Design a protein around this ligand. Structure first.
Ligand SMILES: OCCN(CCO)c1nc(N2CCCCC2)c2nc(N(CCO)CCO)nc(N3CCCCC3)c2n1
Ligand SMILES: [Cl-]
Ligand SMILES: [Cl-]
Ligand SMILES: [Mg+2]
Ligand SMILES: [Mg+2]
Length: 209
Protein backbone atom coordinates (compact mmCIF):
# COMPACT_ATOMS: atom_id res chain seq x y z
CA UNK A 1 0.00 0.00 0.00
CA UNK A 2 0.97 3.67 -0.74
CA UNK A 3 -0.08 6.33 1.83
CA UNK A 4 -0.64 9.94 0.64
CA UNK A 5 -0.13 12.97 2.94
CA UNK A 6 -0.50 16.74 2.62
CA UNK A 7 2.61 18.88 3.21
CA UNK A 8 2.24 21.35 6.12
CA UNK A 9 0.91 24.68 4.68
CA UNK A 10 4.27 26.56 5.16
CA UNK A 11 6.28 23.76 3.37
CA UNK A 12 3.72 23.64 0.47
CA UNK A 13 4.25 27.46 0.28
CA UNK A 14 8.08 27.18 0.29
CA UNK A 15 7.93 24.48 -2.46
CA UNK A 16 5.66 26.69 -4.63
CA UNK A 17 7.95 29.74 -4.15
CA UNK A 18 11.04 27.58 -5.17
CA UNK A 19 9.17 26.32 -8.31
CA UNK A 20 7.54 29.65 -9.44
CA UNK A 21 10.24 32.39 -8.72
CA UNK A 22 12.51 33.31 -11.70
CA UNK A 23 16.00 32.51 -10.26
CA UNK A 24 18.98 31.54 -12.47
CA UNK A 25 21.55 30.34 -9.79
CA UNK A 26 19.98 26.79 -9.60
CA UNK A 27 23.35 24.93 -8.99
CA UNK A 28 23.15 25.57 -5.14
CA UNK A 29 20.74 22.52 -4.91
CA UNK A 30 23.79 20.13 -5.06
CA UNK A 31 25.60 21.82 -2.07
CA UNK A 32 22.40 21.52 0.03
CA UNK A 33 21.91 17.74 -0.63
CA UNK A 34 25.69 16.97 -0.17
CA UNK A 35 25.54 19.00 3.14
CA UNK A 36 22.49 16.87 4.29
CA UNK A 37 24.42 13.62 3.37
CA UNK A 38 27.48 14.88 5.37
CA UNK A 39 25.18 15.51 8.42
CA UNK A 40 23.83 11.89 8.15
CA UNK A 41 27.37 10.42 7.91
CA UNK A 42 28.52 12.49 10.96
CA UNK A 43 25.55 11.16 12.99
CA UNK A 44 26.20 7.41 12.28
CA UNK A 45 30.00 7.87 12.86
CA UNK A 46 29.27 9.66 16.22
CA UNK A 47 26.82 6.93 17.38
CA UNK A 48 29.22 4.10 16.29
CA UNK A 49 31.93 5.45 18.75
CA UNK A 50 29.84 4.29 21.84
CA UNK A 51 28.06 1.36 20.01
CA UNK A 52 30.12 -0.36 17.25
CA UNK A 53 27.14 -2.67 16.25
CA UNK A 54 25.54 0.44 14.46
CA UNK A 55 28.11 -0.15 11.59
CA UNK A 56 27.10 -3.90 11.23
CA UNK A 57 24.73 -2.58 8.45
CA UNK A 58 27.92 -1.38 6.63
CA UNK A 59 31.32 0.26 7.54
CA UNK A 60 32.06 2.46 4.47
CA UNK A 61 31.04 6.16 5.07
CA UNK A 62 30.80 7.86 1.61
CA UNK A 63 28.77 9.91 -0.91
CA UNK A 64 28.32 8.80 -4.56
CA UNK A 65 26.95 11.07 -7.34
CA UNK A 66 25.33 9.03 -10.18
CA UNK A 67 24.20 10.95 -13.31
CA UNK A 68 22.05 8.97 -15.85
CA UNK A 69 21.52 10.79 -19.24
CA UNK A 70 19.16 8.00 -20.56
CA UNK A 71 16.68 8.28 -17.57
CA UNK A 72 17.44 12.05 -17.05
CA UNK A 73 18.15 11.38 -13.29
CA UNK A 74 20.85 12.53 -10.85
CA UNK A 75 21.13 10.28 -7.77
CA UNK A 76 22.95 11.26 -4.49
CA UNK A 77 23.72 8.04 -2.46
CA UNK A 78 25.10 8.18 1.14
CA UNK A 79 25.87 5.51 3.81
CA UNK A 80 24.74 7.85 6.67
CA UNK A 81 22.27 7.19 9.51
CA UNK A 82 19.19 6.99 7.19
CA UNK A 83 15.67 8.21 8.12
CA UNK A 84 12.79 6.38 9.93
CA UNK A 85 9.11 6.31 8.78
CA UNK A 86 8.26 8.91 11.46
CA UNK A 87 11.21 11.12 10.27
CA UNK A 88 9.73 11.10 6.71
CA UNK A 89 6.05 11.56 7.62
CA UNK A 90 6.22 14.22 10.44
CA UNK A 91 9.35 14.57 12.69
CA UNK A 92 11.67 16.25 10.11
CA UNK A 93 8.67 18.45 9.00
CA UNK A 94 7.85 19.65 12.59
CA UNK A 95 11.59 20.56 13.09
CA UNK A 96 11.47 22.45 9.70
CA UNK A 97 8.32 24.57 10.59
CA UNK A 98 10.34 27.49 12.16
CA UNK A 99 13.24 27.57 9.62
CA UNK A 100 10.65 27.48 6.76
CA UNK A 101 8.62 30.34 8.34
CA UNK A 102 11.86 32.40 8.93
CA UNK A 103 13.36 31.70 5.45
CA UNK A 104 10.09 32.95 3.88
CA UNK A 105 10.20 36.13 6.09
CA UNK A 106 13.85 36.69 4.94
CA UNK A 107 12.95 36.27 1.16
CA UNK A 108 10.15 38.90 1.37
CA UNK A 109 12.76 41.24 3.07
CA UNK A 110 15.35 41.05 0.21
CA UNK A 111 17.16 37.68 0.89
CA UNK A 112 17.70 35.34 -2.07
CA UNK A 113 17.03 31.58 -2.47
CA UNK A 114 20.77 30.68 -2.06
CA UNK A 115 20.51 31.30 1.78
CA UNK A 116 17.97 28.39 2.21
CA UNK A 117 20.75 26.28 3.82
CA UNK A 118 21.23 28.88 6.63
CA UNK A 119 17.55 28.10 7.65
CA UNK A 120 17.97 24.23 7.84
CA UNK A 121 15.53 23.60 4.84
CA UNK A 122 18.04 23.11 1.97
CA UNK A 123 16.39 19.78 0.82
CA UNK A 124 13.53 21.72 -0.94
CA UNK A 125 16.13 23.45 -3.18
CA UNK A 126 15.97 20.07 -5.10
CA UNK A 127 12.76 21.54 -6.69
CA UNK A 128 14.92 24.19 -8.53
CA UNK A 129 16.09 21.41 -10.91
CA UNK A 130 13.72 18.36 -10.36
CA UNK A 131 10.01 17.93 -11.28
CA UNK A 132 10.01 14.80 -9.03
CA UNK A 133 12.21 13.67 -6.12
CA UNK A 134 12.30 10.06 -4.78
CA UNK A 135 14.07 9.47 -1.41
CA UNK A 136 14.84 5.76 -0.67
CA UNK A 137 16.08 5.40 2.96
CA UNK A 138 17.13 2.71 5.55
CA UNK A 139 17.79 3.46 9.29
CA UNK A 140 19.08 0.65 11.62
CA UNK A 141 15.87 0.99 13.76
CA UNK A 142 13.27 0.72 10.87
CA UNK A 143 12.52 -0.83 7.40
CA UNK A 144 13.41 0.60 3.94
CA UNK A 145 10.97 3.38 2.79
CA UNK A 146 10.49 5.34 -0.44
CA UNK A 147 9.36 8.97 -0.03
CA UNK A 148 8.29 10.74 -3.26
CA UNK A 149 6.75 14.10 -4.30
CA UNK A 150 6.30 16.07 -7.54
CA UNK A 151 5.16 18.96 -5.26
CA UNK A 152 1.55 20.09 -5.74
CA UNK A 153 0.79 19.92 -2.00
CA UNK A 154 1.25 16.17 -1.36
CA UNK A 155 3.87 13.41 -0.96
CA UNK A 156 3.66 9.58 -0.70
CA UNK A 157 5.39 7.06 1.65
CA UNK A 158 5.55 3.29 0.85
CA UNK A 159 7.62 0.27 2.01
CA UNK A 160 10.42 -0.16 -0.68
CA UNK A 161 10.60 -3.65 -2.33
CA UNK A 162 13.63 -3.01 -4.67
CA UNK A 163 17.45 -3.42 -4.21
CA UNK A 164 17.97 -3.36 -0.44
CA UNK A 165 20.59 -0.83 0.74
CA UNK A 166 22.20 -1.70 4.11
CA UNK A 167 21.86 1.77 5.73
CA UNK A 168 21.61 5.32 4.32
CA UNK A 169 19.77 7.35 1.69
CA UNK A 170 19.42 7.51 -2.12
CA UNK A 171 17.96 10.85 -3.43
CA UNK A 172 16.68 10.39 -7.06
CA UNK A 173 16.32 13.76 -8.90
CA UNK A 174 13.98 13.44 -11.95
CA UNK A 175 15.40 16.55 -13.71
CA UNK A 176 13.36 19.19 -15.63
CA UNK A 177 13.85 18.98 -19.47
CA UNK A 178 15.94 22.26 -19.41
CA UNK A 179 18.23 21.21 -16.44
CA UNK A 180 20.33 18.42 -18.16
CA UNK A 181 23.58 20.39 -17.61
CA UNK A 182 23.60 18.72 -14.09
CA UNK A 183 24.13 15.32 -15.81
CA UNK A 184 27.43 16.64 -17.36
CA UNK A 185 30.72 15.34 -15.83
CA UNK A 186 32.58 18.71 -15.99
CA UNK A 187 29.54 20.69 -14.57
CA UNK A 188 29.14 18.30 -11.57
CA UNK A 189 32.94 18.62 -10.86
CA UNK A 190 32.77 22.47 -11.21
CA UNK A 191 29.89 22.64 -8.64
CA UNK A 192 31.48 20.17 -6.10
CA UNK A 193 34.85 22.13 -6.16
CA UNK A 194 33.03 25.52 -5.80
CA UNK A 195 30.44 24.79 -3.02
CA UNK A 196 31.54 21.57 -1.16
CA UNK A 197 35.41 21.23 -1.35
CA UNK A 198 35.51 20.80 2.55
CA UNK A 199 33.27 17.71 3.25
CA UNK A 200 34.90 15.10 5.57
CA UNK A 201 33.96 12.07 3.39
CA UNK A 202 34.90 10.85 -0.12
CA UNK A 203 32.55 12.11 -2.89
CA UNK A 204 32.87 9.79 -5.98
CA UNK A 205 31.39 10.93 -9.32
CA UNK A 206 30.34 7.73 -11.22
CA UNK A 207 31.02 8.12 -15.04
CA UNK A 208 28.28 6.76 -17.31
CA UNK A 209 29.99 4.55 -20.04
O1 LIG B 1 19.32 15.58 1.13
C1 LIG B 1 18.05 15.00 1.26
C2 LIG B 1 18.11 13.60 1.84
N1 LIG B 1 18.46 13.47 3.27
C3 LIG B 1 19.23 12.28 3.64
C4 LIG B 1 20.67 12.45 3.85
O2 LIG B 1 21.14 11.17 4.26
C5 LIG B 1 17.92 14.22 4.23
N2 LIG B 1 18.65 14.40 5.33
C6 LIG B 1 18.19 15.20 6.29
N3 LIG B 1 18.89 15.24 7.44
C7 LIG B 1 20.24 14.70 7.62
C8 LIG B 1 20.17 13.25 8.09
C9 LIG B 1 19.26 13.03 9.30
C10 LIG B 1 17.96 13.81 9.17
C11 LIG B 1 18.23 15.24 8.76
C12 LIG B 1 16.90 15.74 6.18
N4 LIG B 1 16.41 16.59 7.13
C13 LIG B 1 15.19 17.10 6.93
N5 LIG B 1 14.72 18.00 7.80
C14 LIG B 1 15.41 18.30 9.06
C15 LIG B 1 16.15 19.60 9.01
O3 LIG B 1 17.49 19.44 9.45
C16 LIG B 1 13.63 18.92 7.42
C17 LIG B 1 13.99 20.03 6.44
O4 LIG B 1 14.42 19.54 5.18
N6 LIG B 1 14.45 16.87 5.83
C18 LIG B 1 14.88 16.04 4.89
N7 LIG B 1 14.01 15.77 3.89
C19 LIG B 1 14.23 14.90 2.73
C20 LIG B 1 13.48 13.59 2.89
C21 LIG B 1 12.43 13.63 3.98
C22 LIG B 1 11.67 14.94 3.98
C23 LIG B 1 12.59 16.15 4.01
C24 LIG B 1 16.16 15.45 5.01
N8 LIG B 1 16.68 14.66 4.04
CL1 LIG C 1 21.43 8.88 5.39
CL1 LIG D 1 -3.54 14.24 -5.94
MG1 LIG E 1 21.17 14.05 0.12
MG1 LIG F 1 21.22 11.15 -0.27
Amino acid sequence: EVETFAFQAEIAQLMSLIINTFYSNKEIFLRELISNSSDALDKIRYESLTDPSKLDSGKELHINLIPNKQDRTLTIVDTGIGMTKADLINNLGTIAKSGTKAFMEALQAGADISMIGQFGVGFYSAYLVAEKVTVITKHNDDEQYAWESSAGGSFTVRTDTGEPMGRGTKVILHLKEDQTEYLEERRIKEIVKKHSQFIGYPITLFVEK
